[PDB]
Structures are given as C-alpha cells and as structure tokens.
Design a protein around this ligand. Sequence first.
Ligand SMILES: Nc1ncnc2c1ncn2[C@H]1C[C@H](O)[C@@H](COP(=O)(O)NP(=O)(O)OP(=O)(O)O)O1
Ligand SMILES: [Mg+2]
Length: 427
Amino acid sequence: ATGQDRVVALVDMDCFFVQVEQRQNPHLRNKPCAVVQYKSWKGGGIIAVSYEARAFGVTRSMWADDAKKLCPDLLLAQVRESRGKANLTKYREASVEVMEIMSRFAVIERASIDEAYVDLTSAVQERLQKLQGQPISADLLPSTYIEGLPQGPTTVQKEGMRKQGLFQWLDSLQIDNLTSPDLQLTVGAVIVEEMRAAIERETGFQCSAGISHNKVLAKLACGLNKPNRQTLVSHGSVPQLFSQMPIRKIRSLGGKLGASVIEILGIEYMGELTQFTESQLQSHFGEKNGSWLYAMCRGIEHDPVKPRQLPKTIGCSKNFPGKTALATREQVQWWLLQLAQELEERLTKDRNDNDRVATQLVVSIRVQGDKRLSSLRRCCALTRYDAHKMSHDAFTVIKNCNTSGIQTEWSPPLTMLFLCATKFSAS
DNA sequence: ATATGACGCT
DNA sequence: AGCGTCAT
Ligand SMILES: Nc1ncnc2c1ncn2[C@H]1C[C@H](O)[C@@H](COP(=O)(O)NP(=O)(O)OP(=O)(O)O)O1
Ligand SMILES: [Mg+2]
C-alpha cells in the first residue's frame, strides 16, 4: 500500500479574469484591481480580484461599492455583460487557449474556467528513462516549493528560504531507483515548470501549480505557494501539513458534510481522522465515505484524472432577485428567448469546434418564496439549434407551473431562469 | 440582492 | 429523470 502510485498535478491561473482584462488594459498591470459583474446594485458583485487588491483586503461576492470602501486604488475592470446577463466570452475563449498548452504534455481534466487536473504518470516514466541517472538540478525548478523543508537542526528572505529548501530535497533523492515516489513526484515537478513556463510563454498568463500523488493533495499544494510558483507535496509532508489542516478545506468537505464530519466525530483537522478505522468510519457516513475519508487523512485518494477538456452541459442562467422577479407571461417568454439566444450563440461555437450536438435541454426556475438554487428541473429533447424553438420549447415545459387563473400575469413571480443543453453527441 | 458546471443519489 | 451538494 502506498497511494503514491500516480503522479498528478493541479495547475490554476493566478486571478484569471484579472489577467485576461490586464492583457488588454495595460493600466491594470502592477495595480490593485477587481472585476465587477453588472453595475447597479452596490456597484456590482466582484467575482475576480487581483493580488494587489487582496493586500488591501478585497474579496469576491463582496459588492464593488463596498470594496471601494476598503480599496481606493481599485481600478475596476467591468465584465462585459450582454443580453442582460453575463457574457464570459473573453474568458471561456482564453481558458480554451490555456488548456491546449497543458495537453501538449499530458492528457488533463478540465476542472474550472481557470484550473485543470493533469495525470503526469505516463510522462514521468518518459523522462525518468530519458535520464540515465543524471541527477535533477535546482535550475530546472526555478520556482518550486518543497512542503516541509528546510528542517531539523537549523536568512529571512522568502526566496532564500526556497533555495535551501529545494536544496535539501534533491540531496536526499534516489536518482537511480526510478521507482521511488519522491523521484517520480520530482521528475513530474519538472514537466510542470516546463508546462507552466510555456503557458506564460504563449499567453502571457501566469499560473501556479501543486504536485502530489492524488488530486485532493495536488490542489492543497497548488494554493500553498501563490502566486507564480508550484509546490510539490510529498506523501511524507502529508502528516505534517494535514495536522493543522482544517477539514473544511478539503474538496468535498467544504459543506454540510464537512460539519457532520467535524461535528459527529468531534474534530477540527484532517489528521485526527487517522484514529478511526475504515469500517468503524463507514458506520457514521456511509460505505463510500468511510472508504474515502479513511485513506484521505492518509493522503490516499483514487479519484482518477478524467480525460476531458470540452465539458458537458452548455448552460446559461439569469437571476431576477426581489423586486425584479418575473411575474408576467410576456416577461418569461422574452427572458426565455434572450436566454435561448445566448445558448444559440454558445452551442454553435461548440459544434464547429468540438464535433458534438446536444440532444437534451433542461429548463429550471425558482419561485419568489424558495431558498433552493433550483425549485424545478424540467426537460425536453433539443432537436434544432433554434432560439425561437428552444424559447417556445421551454415555455410549454414550464407553463404548467403558473398557479393562476390570471393568464395575463404569472403566479407566483419567478426569481430564476436557467437553460442548459446536455447529452452531447458525436457530430 | 453575489453566474456557471460537476457529480452522487433516487 | 430530477433533486440535493459542492466547487469556482
Ligand atoms: N464565487 C465565484 N462566483 C463566480 N465566479 C467565480 C467565483 N469564484 C471565482 N470565480 C471566477 C473568477 C475567477 O477569475 C475564476 C477563477 O478564480 P478562482 O479559482 O476562484 N481563484 P483565481 O484564479 O481568480 O485567483 P487564485 O487562484 O490566486 O485564488 O473563476
Ligand atoms: Mg479556482
């Protein structure tokens, strides 16, 4: 048993949307900025935030007019909004630049607009053989941080720290035994400096990464050292790091389950999960959660890097909160249309680029009096890439919710509308 | 009154 | 198929 079988990495762009705005507005470069969505209610919900604006304390979800309370220098690059909602075309088109690069190395799995898991297992056996045993040098890793080094019997500069830390790791390394989990992790951490350096080469976009043995730890190390650096995380640094690591951090456990993992066990850290055996664990969460949250605090997860760049489900959403809420037949046709037209714009730019037709179409709504993000999923075969079809397709599918005799309006007002095309074909 | 996309379960 | 959960 090891869980050091694979080598897996998680690259991720340092404040992506800011970087995409900055490559057209040079005034934004080396300046503390955010990126705002719409512009009326509190100036617009801030989604992306530069790192110079973070050092004044500006957060996402925060409302533009409220960071302009925290941040005077907050040169605010507005998101392009179109058809009344969002238009994220600047970025979804950049994101597809960045993932072309990363696949020149290993077959990755798209994980966000801005990040991608990548399995480097095969290509590590590529480089390791290309080595006759020629030890790996520091120069090859100009920006890699080694979790848990330096140490033992022991400058102040953050970047001298990084040298004498990289320098310890390499010296204790079995450059011959091509099977050591810390020699494969280490070749792999090169493919990623070369991956990430060629990104900023071909895009001007800056990335950070994280490189352990599974995917939950690749992420946990991506965001250790940021921005513009990587971090290898050894299966031996795992017990160290995991010990002060909050359960709420780990991918899956950020939510309701997290609390129960914490509450039901009486815990606050990943490392304290070690003491409960697996079938022991399974009795409080399930047959799959115990099998998982056991080997997790042992830095063993076996979620595979699922080979996928072009996603599934093309989707287009628009909220109508509070006083906006649509209560009118005529409204819920125009918004359905304007939603059905951006889908039309996205779905074509799919079909030529990616060789697939979606056959499904999922309408959703929310009502002025529900908390659930969605209060009704309803579905109907997408046959033709027509807005006016999809628009009128989608009214038939939902009309049967208007609790009214007033067919002049809508009872009760809708606070959300969502069109999503799933079940792509081979076109 | 913060727009997307995935997945496990039923 | 639809809904809850979770991540960004
Ligand atoms: N709650 C949210 N809602 C909508 N969009 C969001 C979002 N959070 C992030 N984004 C959008 C905006 C973001 O530009 C994009 C990816 O942002 P991140 O992966 O969350 N973190 P970033 O790459 O920005 O910087 P760093 O990694 O150093 O934290 O997704
Ligand atoms: Mg991210």
